[PDB]
Amino acid sequence: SGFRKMAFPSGKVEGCMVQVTCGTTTLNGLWLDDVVYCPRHVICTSEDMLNPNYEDLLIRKSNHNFLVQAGNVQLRVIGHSMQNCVLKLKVDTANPKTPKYKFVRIQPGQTFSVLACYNGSPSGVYQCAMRPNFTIKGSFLNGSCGSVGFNIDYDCVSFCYMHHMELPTGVHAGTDLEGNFYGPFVDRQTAQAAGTDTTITVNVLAWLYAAVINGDRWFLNRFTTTLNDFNLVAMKYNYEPLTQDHVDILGPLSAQTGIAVLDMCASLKELLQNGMNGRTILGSALLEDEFTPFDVVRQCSG
Amino acid sequence: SGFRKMAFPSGKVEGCMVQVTCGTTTLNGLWLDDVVYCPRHVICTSEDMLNPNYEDLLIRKSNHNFLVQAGNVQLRVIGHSMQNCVLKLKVDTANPKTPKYKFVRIQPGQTFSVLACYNGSPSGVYQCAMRPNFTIKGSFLNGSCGSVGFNIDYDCVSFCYMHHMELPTGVHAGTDLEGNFYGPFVDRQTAQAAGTDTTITVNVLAWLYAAVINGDRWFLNRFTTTLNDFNLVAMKYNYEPLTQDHVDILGPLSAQTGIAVLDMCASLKELLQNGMNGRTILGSALLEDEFTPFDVVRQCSGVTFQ
Ligand SMILES: N#CCC(=O)NC1CCCCC1
Ligand SMILES: [Cl-]
Ligand code: NA
Numbered sequence: 001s002g003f004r005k006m007a008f009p010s011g012k013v014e015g016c017m018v019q020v021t022c023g024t025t026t027l028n029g030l031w032l033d034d035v036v037y038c039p040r041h042v043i044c045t046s047e048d049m050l051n052p053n054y055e056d057l058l059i060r061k062s063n064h065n066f067l068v069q070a071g072n073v074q075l076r077v078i079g080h081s082m083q084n085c086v087l088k089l090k091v092d093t094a095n096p097k098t099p100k101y102k103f104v105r106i107q108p109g110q111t112f113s114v115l116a117c118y119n120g121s122p123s124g125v126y127q128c129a130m131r132p133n134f135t136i137k138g139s140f141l142n143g144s145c146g147s148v149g150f151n152i153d154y155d156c157v158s159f160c161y162m163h164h165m166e167l168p169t170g171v172h173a174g175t176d177l178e179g180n181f182y183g184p185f186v187d188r189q190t191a192q193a194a195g196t197d198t199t200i201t202v203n204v205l206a207w208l209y210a211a212v213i214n215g216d217r218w219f220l221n222r223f224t225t226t227l228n229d230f231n232l233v234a235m236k237y238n239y240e241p242l243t244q245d246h247v248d249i250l251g252p253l254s255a256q257t258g259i260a261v262l263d264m265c266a267s268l269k270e271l272l273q274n275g276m277n278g279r280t281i282l283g284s285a286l287l288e289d290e291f292t293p294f295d296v297v298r299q300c301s302g
Numbered sequence: 303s304g305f306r307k308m309a310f311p312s313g314k315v316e317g318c319m320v321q322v323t324c325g326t327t328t329l330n331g332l333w334l335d336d337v338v339y340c341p342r343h344v345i346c347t348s349e350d351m352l353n354p355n356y357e358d359l360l361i362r363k364s365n366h367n368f369l370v371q372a373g374n375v376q377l378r379v380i381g382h383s384m385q386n387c388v389l390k391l392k393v394d395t396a397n398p399k400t401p402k403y404k405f406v407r408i409q410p411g412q413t414f415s416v417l418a419c420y421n422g423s424p425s426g427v428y429q430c431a432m433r434p435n436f437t438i439k440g441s442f443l444n445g446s447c448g449s450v451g452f453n454i455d456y457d458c459v460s461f462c463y464m465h466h467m468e469l470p471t472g473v474h475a476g477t478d479l480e481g482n483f484y485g486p487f488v489d490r491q492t493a494q495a496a497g498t499d500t501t502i503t504v505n506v507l508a509w510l511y512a513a514v515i516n517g518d519r520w521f522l523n524r525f526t527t528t529l530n531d532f533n534l535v536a537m538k539y540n541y542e543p544l545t546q547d548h549v550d551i552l553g554p555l556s557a558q559t560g561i562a563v564l565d566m567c568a569s570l571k572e573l574l575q576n577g578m579n580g581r582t583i584l585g586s587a588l589l590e591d592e593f594t595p596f597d598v599v600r601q602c603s604g605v606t607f608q
Contacts, residue, residue: 001441001472002440002441002468003441004430004439006418006427006428006441007426007427008427009425009426009427010311010312010313011313011314011316012313014311014313014608015313115311118604118606119606121606121607122608123308123607124308124600125310125312126306126307127307139303140304141602141603142604144604170516170517172304283439284587285586285588286582286585286586302445
């Protein structure tokens with residue numbers, strides 16, 4: 001029993017974190033086989049913040065301009081190339097700790113673990129979710145760029161996020177491991193603002209199902225709703241639209257608990273209307289939206 | 303910016319996790335040097351659990367009755383002995399991945415990272431606090447016994463918890479790595495209940511400081527208070543008493559933010575008596591008490607471990 005915000009064990013990713021230095025800038029790199037991946041803005045100077053021409057800045061660099069340090073060991077850079085907003089540094093040594101891995105670009109609402117690192121060394125691991133506005137609500141200090149987000153399927157590491165910058169509202173933006181930013185953001189210091197964020201409705205419903213599995217039913221009701229009436233109500237609370245795709249995803253959790261998906265939708269509508277009235281659900285006085293249906297089944301069933 | 307419930311990087315402990323099987327029971331063991339540590343109730347059948355005599359149950363077992371698997375490699379048990387509620391299995395091979403480590407016993411209100419394991423394979427990591435009633439609000443399924451809790455202090459892993467059982471209320475109980483239970487619990491299938499819990503006051507204050515660092519300031523007010531006055535309110539609301547040592551520990555946060563500790567206690571006094579009034583603090587409608595002052599300093603400064 002119990003339900004916690006659970007991250008993946010970080011050891012497989014820890015063995016891949018290195019430090020990348022270019023000029024006076026130092027951030028984190030991801031060392032997989034004989035390639036080190038890091039944000040391309042490591043090559044920017046103080047005058048290259050607003051409108052850097054990365055092709056022009058990169059063509060001026062030599063392999064020895066990049067200092068890559070793995071633990072107490074300097075790796076020799078033997079080549080470099082740009083792919084979108086990430087830099088790929090070819091090194092003369094394959095990482096002997098390289099796990100089974102792949103790169104996956106995730107969709108809003110998906111969750112992943114973040115290994116926050118500074119100077120190539122991990123600081124902590126926590127759980128995140130891609131917000132509907134393509135930001136993440138992380139915990140990052142200066143020097144955390146190049147930290148990665150990931151999931152682990154059995155023993156294969158799925159890298160899905162690399163940290164690039166913090167927006168003025170204190171939220172964070174980054175790329176997949178192919179260098180493509182999540183959302184409309186760019187690696188420039190020009191004024192950028194995240195769109196108004198919304199609640200991940202399918203995740204809230206999955207987390208209500210988790211509460212029932214763990215033995216709590218106080219929030220259910222005798223009502224149901226149509227899918228459209230639910231959405232008409234939920235939008236007024238800044239909730240994401242619930243699609244038929246989302247209803248299908250919740251099928252297994254519905255079958256396990258015996259509560260139809262649209263019945264849970266009616267329970268959610270009432271919670272938004274009433275609040276919790278001094279009660280809690282799985283230890284929280286707010287509705288939690290950073291547990292996916294996949295997260296719930298993995299944590300509640302193994 | 304940002305503040306998250308953050309666990310220590312679990313890599314050093316992942317390399318110590320093994321599978322231990324005794325008869326039909328399989329759980330997790332901790333492999334350090336040439337000894338595997340696991341709960342002593344691994345030797346018990348279902349009827350043994352009702353009223354076990356662990357010394358007598360252990361005599362019948364031979365070294366080959368303990369099947370230890372490190373990954374896909376079997377470990378040869380060459381000796382077995384008991385220390386309190388943990389079993390110690392001497393193996394023929396020292397763990398080459400043994401980190402610099404100590405066995406430590408933590409205090410209520412202290413936090414630690416849990417590496418949840420099944421069949422010797424780590425599956426999750428999350429942060430817990432040792433509650434004042436000596437339970438932890440964990441997330442454990444069947445097969446998770448032997449999962450361990452730990453902190454990291456400059457390359458040295460401090461092992462502080464090993465999971466043993468779940469209480470009827472869904473919270474969890476375990477021992478230190480020397481077999482001593484946290485709380486008034488025993489490893490036997492019998493009527494056991496967690497005592498009435500209280501809120502860790504020093505941790506709530508630390509988390510309010512984390513909120514101020516991150517720009518959440520609406521709960522600040524003009525008032526201050528005294529230790530005696532605040533503890534009267536804390537007792538009324540089932541909050542642990544605030545000691546002078548707690549005030550000293552919060553000292554660094556009191557200067558990084560510019561908010562005195564007693565100044566913050568007056569904010570907490572008002573929040574307890576009036577509530578949050580529809581507002582939130584660091585994205586929470588409840589007062590979070592599982593961040594220690596050292597946790598808040600560590601996350602808001604960037605301290606790393608190898
Ligand atoms: N089961 C299952 C699949 C699942 O959890 N789907 C997620 C994908 C990301 C958005 C939120 C829903
Ligand atoms: Cl996805
Ligand atoms: Na005050």
